[PDB]
Amino acid sequence: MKRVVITGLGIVSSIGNNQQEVLASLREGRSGITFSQELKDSGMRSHVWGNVKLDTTGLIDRKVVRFMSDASIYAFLSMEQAIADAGLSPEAYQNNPRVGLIAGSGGGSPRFQVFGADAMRGPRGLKAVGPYVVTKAMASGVSACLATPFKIHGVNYSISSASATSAHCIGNAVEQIQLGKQDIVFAGGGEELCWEMACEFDAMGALSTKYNDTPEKASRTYDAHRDGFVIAGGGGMVVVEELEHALARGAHIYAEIVGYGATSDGADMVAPSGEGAVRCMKMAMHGVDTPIDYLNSHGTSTPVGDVKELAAIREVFGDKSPAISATKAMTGHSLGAAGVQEAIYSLLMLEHGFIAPSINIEELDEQAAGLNIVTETTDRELTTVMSNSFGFGGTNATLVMRKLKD
Amino acid sequence: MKRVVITGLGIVSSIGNNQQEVLASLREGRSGITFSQELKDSGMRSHVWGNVKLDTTGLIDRKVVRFMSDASIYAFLSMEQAIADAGLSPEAYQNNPRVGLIAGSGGGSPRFQVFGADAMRGPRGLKAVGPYVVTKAMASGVSACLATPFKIHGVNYSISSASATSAHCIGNAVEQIQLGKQDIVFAGGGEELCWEMACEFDAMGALSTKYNDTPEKASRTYDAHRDGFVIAGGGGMVVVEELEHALARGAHIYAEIVGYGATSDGADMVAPSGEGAVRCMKMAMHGVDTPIDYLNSHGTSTPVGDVKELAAIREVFGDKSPAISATKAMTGHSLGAAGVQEAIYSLLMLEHGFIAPSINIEELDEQAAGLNIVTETTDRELTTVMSNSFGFGGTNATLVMRKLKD
Ligand SMILES: *C(=O)CCCCCCCCC
Ligand SMILES: *C(=O)CCCCCCCCC
Ligand SMILES: [O-]
Ligand SMILES: [O-]
C-alpha cells in the first residue's frame, strides 16, 4: 500500500561517467563501443566492447578499494553519485536500520577468481594469492563492498539473475519498502569487463564477430544483419525511497515505480521463450491505468533474442504498441549492470522529455515491421516508461516507472 | 499478512545424503570432516574439508546436467528430495505462475571460471572452453539450472550474501508469500567444494590448519583451541508454502516461519561487529510470543567470530539463554549452503524432539561462561527454534521457526 519513488541516481557506463555525460550521449545517439586489444590478444573472435572510459585509480580510499573488484568499484562510484544526487547527508543514511542496499553482478569477478588460481599454482602459492581475493571473487562482492564502507545497517545482500540482475535488485528494493521494512534502499549493480569472462560468451557464439573493423556498428538491435551482442561493463545505482519519506525531506523525485514483474520461462537455458516475457510485462502493467509511452527493450542485438521480445511485445500491446528503442545498440550489453543502467536511461528520457534513438538499423528485420521503433532522437513528453531485462535461465524482469502527478 | 510454513526439505551434506542420514549423524554427533588429498596437493595449509560423500554420476539427465556446476547439482538433488517429501506432483508446481524458486551460492563456480580461462589460454582456445561454461560460472547458476528443468514459472533468481546466502533466500521466499505473489517457493542453495576457492580462504588465514592429522577435531566451535573454519560443500532446499494452501492439500507441516531478520553491520569487511547480530536476532523475534528453546548458532569455529556471536547472544538473552549448539563442529562450513542446511538441521531437531550436540569442545572458551551450550545429545520437546547466519561484508540473517498449533 506504500508508494515507492526514485530520488537519486549515479552511473558509470560506456557512454558516460555521470548522468550529464550519459544524457549527451543518449541525445546524440553516440556509440560507446570501441575496439579491444585485450580481447583480440586473448584469441577471441569478438574484438569489440563497451568499456568504461575512466581511470579509477585513486578515486577510492586505499583501505576500502583493496577489497574490491571492478564490479564493486563501478557500483561504488555510482553510489557516491546517487547519494549526492539524492541530497542525502551521512547522518540520514548511515547507521540507519531503515536504510539498506541490494546490488549484485552477473559473474562476480572471473578476473580475480582466475588470478587466485594462477597465483596459487605459481611457486609462491598462498603468498602470491594474498588475503583480499575472497571479497573480490565472491558473488556478493558488489553489496558487501558497498554496504560496509557506507555504514549501511538495513538489508544487505545481492540478487543475481544474469542480464536481469540489477532489475531484480530494484524490484526487490521496492518490495522491502512496500513491506514497511525500509524507507530507503540503494539498488543497482556492476559488472567487470575482461576477457576471462568474455571468452565464455564468445565460446557459445553469443558475441558479435563480423564488425570488429567498425566497432561502432557491431551492436545493431533489430538490424537484419545483427550477429550477437557486444559485451560491456560498468555500474549503476538508484535511490529507492518510500514516498512520504521522500516528500518529507523535499527530495527531487524522478518517478514512481508503479509496476514490477518477475517471471520465469521454465523452458530454455539460453534463449527466451517469449511466453515468460508476456507474463512478466502483463504483471508489471497490472494496476497501471496509463498507457506505456516508451519501452526500453532488452534487445541485445542477437538473432533470436530481438524477435522473441518483439513478438512478446506484439502479444501484450496489440495495436497500441509504445515507442521502442534499444539503447544497447549504443552502449552494448552490460549484463549484470544492464538492468539499473537502462532504468537510468529511461528515467533520463522521462525527466528530459525525449526518446533516445535505436541506432545502427540499416535494414529492419521483417518481424519488426509495423512497430514504432524510434531511430532518431525525438523530443516528446513521456509519462510512463517500461524497461525489460531477460537473462539466461529464463529469468525475466520488467519495471514500469511513471512521472509523479505535477 | 499471510502465514508461511515449510512443507518439505531435501539435503546433501557432509553428514548425509538425505534427511534420514542427517538425522542419524546429528543424533550421534558424527563428524563429516575428512582429509582432502586435493587440498594438500594444491599447496594449501588446510587439508580438511566437509565433502559430499556421494557419486553424482548419472543421477541427472545428460541434457540437463551439462549446464551445471556442482553447486547446482547439489541444489538440484536436494530439490528432487524436497519435492517428494512435500508430496507435490508435476502438475502442481510445473508451469504454475504462483510457484517460484529462490536459491543461490556464495561463490558461483570458481572451478569452471578457472576452467574457461585455462582452456582459452590453451592450444584449442574457444573450442576447449565449450558452450556450457557461462551457465556453470554465472553467479545465478543455482537458480537458473533448477528453474528451467523444473518448469518454474514464478519468481526466479539467486540471492547471494556470503555465509548468509541460503538464509536470505528462505527469508525472501517468505516475503514473496506474505506479499501474496506466490503460494509456493523452493528456497535453498548449494556450494561446490574445490581448491580453486578454498585456497583463497587459506590465503587470508581463515581455515583450520593445526588439526590436519586429526580431521574430525579440526572444526571445534567454542573450544579454546579452535583455529579457523573447516570448509565444506553441499546443498539444501526447502519448500516454503502459504499456510491455507498447504492445509488444503493435506501437506505435512514441519513448522511455521514466524520470524525473519536481515541486517547489516556497516563495520568490518571480514569480522562481525556483534551489534548487527543483536539487531538481527531481535528483529526475527519481534512478535514471537513463545521463548526460544534452541539456537543453532552460526559458530564457524574461528577465534573472533565465535566470541562476537556469543556476546551478541548474551546481549539478547542475558541469563535466560536458550539451548545452544554449533552444528558446524560436525559439518564444517558449507558457506552459501550453510543457511538452508542449518535451517534443515533445526527443523529435524524440532520435528524429532532432540538437540544435536556441539562437539569437539575440550576446553570451553571463557566468554561462553553462563550460556546453555549443549555438548551431548539431549532429548527434549522443542517448540521454537532460531538459526543464525552471518557473512563477510557484515550481512546478517536470522530465521525463527515454530511448531504449528496441532
Ligand atoms: C543475460 O542473461 C545474458 C547472459 C548473462 C550471464 C550473467 C553474466 C555471467 C558472467 C560469467
Ligand atoms: C561467510 O561469510 C564466510 C565467507 C564466505 C564468502 C563467500 C563464499 C566464497 C566465495 C568465493
Ligand atoms: O536490461
Ligand atoms: O549459517
Coordinates of N, CA and C in Angstrom, one line a residue, chain A residues 275-393:
Chain A
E275 N 7.0 -16.4 -24.0 CA 5.9 -16.7 -23.2 C 6.1 -16.1 -21.8
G276 N 7.3 -16.2 -21.2 CA 7.5 -15.7 -19.9 C 7.6 -14.2 -19.9
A277 N 8.1 -13.6 -21.0 CA 8.1 -12.2 -21.2 C 6.7 -11.6 -21.2
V278 N 5.8 -12.3 -21.9 CA 4.4 -11.8 -22.0 C 3.8 -11.7 -20.6
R279 N 4.0 -12.7 -19.8 CA 3.5 -12.7 -18.4 C 4.2 -11.7 -17.6
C280 N 5.5 -11.5 -17.7 CA 6.3 -10.5 -17.0 C 5.7 -9.1 -17.2
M281 N 5.6 -8.7 -18.5 CA 5.1 -7.4 -18.8 C 3.7 -7.2 -18.3
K282 N 2.8 -8.2 -18.5 CA 1.5 -8.0 -18.1 C 1.4 -7.8 -16.6
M283 N 2.2 -8.5 -15.8 CA 2.3 -8.4 -14.4 C 2.7 -7.0 -14.0
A284 N 3.7 -6.4 -14.7 CA 4.2 -5.1 -14.4 C 3.2 -4.0 -14.7
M285 N 2.3 -4.3 -15.6 CA 1.3 -3.3 -16.0 C 0.0 -3.4 -15.2
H286 N -0.1 -4.5 -14.4 CA -1.3 -4.7 -13.6 C -1.4 -3.5 -12.7
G287 N -2.6 -2.8 -12.7 CA -2.8 -1.7 -11.9 C -2.4 -0.4 -12.5
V288 N -1.6 -0.4 -13.6 CA -1.2 0.8 -14.2 C -2.3 1.2 -15.2
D289 N -2.9 2.3 -14.8 CA -4.0 2.8 -15.7 C -3.6 3.7 -16.9
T290 N -2.4 4.2 -16.9 CA -2.0 5.0 -18.0 C -1.3 4.1 -19.0
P291 N -1.3 4.5 -20.3 CA -0.6 3.7 -21.3 C 0.9 3.9 -21.3
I292 N 1.6 2.9 -21.9 CA 3.1 3.0 -21.9 C 3.5 3.9 -23.0
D293 N 4.2 5.0 -22.8 CA 4.6 5.9 -23.8 C 5.9 5.4 -24.5
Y294 N 6.8 4.8 -23.7 CA 8.1 4.3 -24.2 C 8.5 3.1 -23.6
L295 N 9.1 2.2 -24.4 CA 9.6 0.9 -23.9 C 11.1 0.7 -24.3
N296 N 11.9 0.6 -23.2 CA 13.3 0.4 -23.4 C 13.5 -1.1 -23.4
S297 N 13.5 -1.7 -24.6 CA 13.6 -3.1 -24.7 C 14.9 -3.7 -24.2
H298 N 14.9 -5.0 -24.1 CA 16.1 -5.7 -23.7 C 17.1 -5.8 -24.9
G299 N 16.4 -6.0 -26.0 CA 17.1 -6.1 -27.3 C 18.7 -6.0 -27.3
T300 N 19.3 -7.2 -27.2 CA 20.7 -7.3 -27.1 C 21.4 -7.4 -28.5
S301 N 20.6 -7.4 -29.6 CA 21.1 -7.4 -30.9 C 21.5 -8.8 -31.3
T302 N 20.8 -9.8 -30.8 CA 21.0 -11.2 -31.2 C 19.9 -11.6 -32.1
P303 N 20.2 -12.6 -33.0 CA 19.3 -13.1 -34.0 C 17.9 -13.5 -33.4
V304 N 18.0 -14.5 -32.5 CA 16.7 -15.0 -31.9 C 16.2 -14.0 -30.8
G305 N 17.0 -13.5 -29.9 CA 16.6 -12.7 -28.9 C 15.7 -11.5 -29.2
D306 N 16.2 -10.6 -30.1 CA 15.4 -9.4 -30.5 C 14.0 -9.7 -31.0
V307 N 13.8 -10.8 -31.8 CA 12.5 -11.1 -32.3 C 11.6 -11.7 -31.3
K308 N 12.1 -12.6 -30.4 CA 11.3 -13.2 -29.4 C 10.6 -12.1 -28.6
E309 N 11.4 -11.1 -28.2 CA 10.9 -10.0 -27.4 C 9.9 -9.1 -28.2
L310 N 10.1 -9.0 -29.5 CA 9.2 -8.2 -30.3 C 7.8 -8.9 -30.4
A311 N 7.9 -10.2 -30.5 CA 6.7 -11.0 -30.6 C 5.9 -10.9 -29.2
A312 N 6.6 -10.9 -28.1 CA 6.0 -10.7 -26.8 C 5.4 -9.4 -26.7
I313 N 6.1 -8.4 -27.3 CA 5.5 -7.0 -27.2 C 4.3 -6.9 -28.1
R314 N 4.2 -7.6 -29.2 CA 3.0 -7.5 -30.1 C 1.9 -8.2 -29.3
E315 N 2.1 -9.4 -28.7 CA 1.1 -10.0 -28.0 C 0.5 -9.3 -26.8
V316 N 1.3 -8.5 -26.2 CA 0.9 -7.7 -25.0 C 0.1 -6.4 -25.3
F317 N 0.7 -5.7 -26.3 CA 0.0 -4.4 -26.7 C -0.9 -4.4 -27.9
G318 N -0.8 -5.4 -28.7 CA -1.7 -5.5 -29.9 C -1.5 -4.3 -30.8
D319 N -2.5 -3.5 -31.0 CA -2.4 -2.3 -31.9 C -2.0 -1.0 -31.2
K320 N -1.8 -1.1 -29.9 CA -1.4 0.1 -29.1 C 0.0 -0.1 -28.6
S321 N 0.9 -0.5 -29.4 CA 2.3 -0.7 -29.0 C 3.0 0.7 -28.8
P322 N 3.8 0.8 -27.8 CA 4.5 2.0 -27.4 C 5.7 2.3 -28.3
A323 N 6.4 3.5 -28.1 CA 7.6 3.8 -28.9 C 8.6 2.9 -28.3
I324 N 9.5 2.4 -29.2 CA 10.5 1.5 -28.7 C 11.9 1.8 -29.3
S325 N 12.9 1.5 -28.5 CA 14.3 1.8 -28.9 C 15.2 0.9 -28.0
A326 N 16.2 0.4 -28.5 CA 17.2 -0.5 -27.7 C 18.4 0.3 -27.5
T327 N 18.7 0.8 -26.3 CA 19.9 1.6 -26.1 C 21.2 0.7 -26.1
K328 N 21.0 -0.6 -26.1 CA 22.2 -1.5 -26.2 C 22.9 -1.3 -27.5
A329 N 22.3 -0.7 -28.5 CA 22.9 -0.5 -29.8 C 24.0 0.5 -29.6
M330 N 23.8 1.4 -28.6 CA 24.8 2.4 -28.3 C 25.8 2.0 -27.3
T331 N 25.3 1.4 -26.2 CA 26.0 1.0 -25.0 C 26.7 -0.4 -25.0
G332 N 26.0 -1.3 -25.6 CA 26.5 -2.7 -25.6 C 25.7 -3.3 -24.4
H333 N 25.9 -4.6 -24.2 CA 25.2 -5.4 -23.2 C 26.1 -5.4 -21.9
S334 N 25.7 -4.6 -20.9 CA 26.5 -4.6 -19.6 C 26.1 -5.8 -18.6
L335 N 25.3 -6.7 -19.1 CA 25.0 -7.9 -18.3 C 24.4 -7.5 -16.9
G336 N 25.1 -7.8 -15.9 CA 24.6 -7.5 -14.5 C 24.2 -6.1 -14.3
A337 N 24.9 -5.1 -15.0 CA 24.6 -3.7 -14.8 C 23.5 -3.2 -15.7
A338 N 23.1 -4.0 -16.7 CA 22.1 -3.6 -17.7 C 20.8 -3.1 -17.1
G339 N 20.3 -3.9 -16.2 CA 19.0 -3.5 -15.6 C 18.9 -2.1 -15.0
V340 N 19.9 -1.8 -14.1 CA 19.9 -0.5 -13.5 C 20.3 0.6 -14.4
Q341 N 21.2 0.4 -15.3 CA 21.7 1.4 -16.2 C 20.5 1.8 -17.2
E342 N 19.8 0.8 -17.7 CA 18.7 1.1 -18.6 C 17.6 1.7 -17.9
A343 N 17.4 1.5 -16.6 CA 16.3 2.1 -15.9 C 16.7 3.6 -15.8
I344 N 18.0 3.8 -15.7 CA 18.5 5.2 -15.6 C 18.4 5.9 -16.9
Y345 N 18.6 5.2 -18.0 CA 18.5 5.9 -19.3 C 17.0 6.2 -19.5
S346 N 16.1 5.4 -19.0 CA 14.7 5.6 -19.1 C 14.2 6.8 -18.2
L347 N 14.8 6.9 -17.1 CA 14.5 7.9 -16.1 C 14.9 9.3 -16.7
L348 N 16.1 9.2 -17.4 CA 16.6 10.5 -18.0 C 15.7 10.9 -19.2
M349 N 15.2 9.9 -19.9 CA 14.3 10.2 -21.0 C 13.0 10.8 -20.5
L350 N 12.5 10.3 -19.4 CA 11.3 10.8 -18.8 C 11.5 12.2 -18.2
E351 N 12.6 12.4 -17.5 CA 12.9 13.7 -16.9 C 13.2 14.8 -17.9
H352 N 13.8 14.4 -19.1 CA 14.1 15.4 -20.1 C 13.2 15.4 -21.3
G353 N 12.1 14.7 -21.3 CA 11.2 14.6 -22.4 C 11.8 14.3 -23.7
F354 N 12.4 13.1 -23.9 CA 12.9 12.8 -25.2 C 13.1 11.2 -25.3
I355 N 13.2 10.7 -26.5 CA 13.3 9.3 -26.7 C 14.7 9.1 -27.4
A356 N 15.6 8.3 -26.8 CA 16.9 8.1 -27.3 C 16.6 7.1 -28.5
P357 N 17.4 7.3 -29.6 CA 17.3 6.5 -30.8 C 17.8 5.1 -30.8
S358 N 17.2 4.2 -31.6 CA 17.7 2.8 -31.6 C 18.5 2.9 -32.9
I359 N 19.9 3.0 -32.7 CA 20.8 3.2 -33.8 C 21.2 1.9 -34.5
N360 N 22.0 2.1 -35.6 CA 22.5 1.1 -36.5 C 21.6 0.2 -37.2
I361 N 20.4 0.7 -37.5 CA 19.4 -0.1 -38.2 C 19.5 0.3 -39.7
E362 N 20.2 -0.5 -40.5 CA 20.3 -0.2 -41.9 C 19.2 -0.9 -42.7
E363 N 18.9 -2.1 -42.2 CA 17.8 -2.9 -42.8 C 17.0 -3.5 -41.6
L364 N 15.8 -3.0 -41.5 CA 14.9 -3.5 -40.4 C 14.5 -4.9 -40.6
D365 N 14.6 -5.7 -39.6 CA 14.2 -7.1 -39.6 C 12.7 -7.2 -39.9
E366 N 12.3 -8.2 -40.8 CA 10.9 -8.4 -41.2 C 10.0 -8.4 -40.0
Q367 N 10.3 -9.1 -39.0 CA 9.5 -9.3 -37.8 C 9.3 -8.0 -37.0
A368 N 10.1 -7.0 -37.3 CA 9.9 -5.7 -36.5 C 9.0 -4.8 -37.3
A369 N 8.6 -5.2 -38.5 CA 7.7 -4.4 -39.3 C 6.4 -3.9 -38.6
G370 N 6.1 -2.7 -38.8 CA 4.9 -2.1 -38.2 C 5.0 -1.5 -36.8
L371 N 6.1 -1.9 -36.1 CA 6.3 -1.4 -34.7 C 6.9 0.0 -34.8
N372 N 6.7 0.8 -33.8 CA 7.2 2.2 -33.8 C 8.6 2.2 -33.1
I373 N 9.6 1.7 -33.8 CA 10.9 1.7 -33.3 C 11.6 3.0 -33.7
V374 N 11.8 3.9 -32.7 CA 12.4 5.2 -33.0 C 13.8 5.1 -33.4
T375 N 14.2 5.7 -34.5 CA 15.6 5.6 -35.0 C 16.3 6.9 -35.0
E376 N 15.6 8.0 -34.5 CA 16.3 9.3 -34.5 C 15.8 10.0 -33.2
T377 N 16.7 10.6 -32.5 CA 16.3 11.3 -31.2 C 15.0 12.1 -31.5
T378 N 14.0 11.9 -30.6 CA 12.7 12.5 -30.7 C 12.3 13.2 -29.4
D379 N 12.1 14.5 -29.4 CA 11.6 15.2 -28.2 C 10.1 14.9 -28.1
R380 N 9.7 14.6 -26.8 CA 8.3 14.3 -26.5 C 8.1 14.1 -25.1
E381 N 6.9 14.5 -24.6 CA 6.5 14.4 -23.2 C 6.2 13.0 -22.9
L382 N 7.0 12.3 -22.1 CA 6.7 11.0 -21.6 C 6.1 11.0 -20.2
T383 N 5.3 10.0 -19.9 CA 4.6 10.0 -18.6 C 4.9 8.6 -18.0
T384 N 4.8 7.6 -18.8 CA 5.0 6.2 -18.3 C 6.0 5.4 -19.2
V385 N 7.0 4.9 -18.6 CA 8.0 4.1 -19.4 C 8.2 2.8 -18.8
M386 N 8.5 1.8 -19.7 CA 8.7 0.4 -19.3 C 10.1 0.0 -19.7
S387 N 10.7 -0.9 -18.9 CA 12.1 -1.4 -19.3 C 12.2 -2.9 -19.0
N388 N 12.6 -3.6 -20.1 CA 12.7 -5.1 -20.0 C 14.2 -5.6 -19.8
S389 N 14.2 -6.7 -19.0 CA 15.5 -7.3 -18.7 C 15.2 -8.9 -18.7
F390 N 15.8 -9.6 -19.6 CA 15.6 -11.0 -19.7 C 17.0 -11.7 -19.6
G391 N 17.2 -12.6 -18.7 CA 18.5 -13.3 -18.6 C 18.5 -14.8 -18.9
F392 N 19.7 -15.4 -19.0 CA 19.8 -16.8 -19.2 C 19.1 -17.5 -18.0
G393 N 18.6 -18.7 -18.2 CA 17.9 -19.4 -17.2 C 16.5 -19.0 -17.2

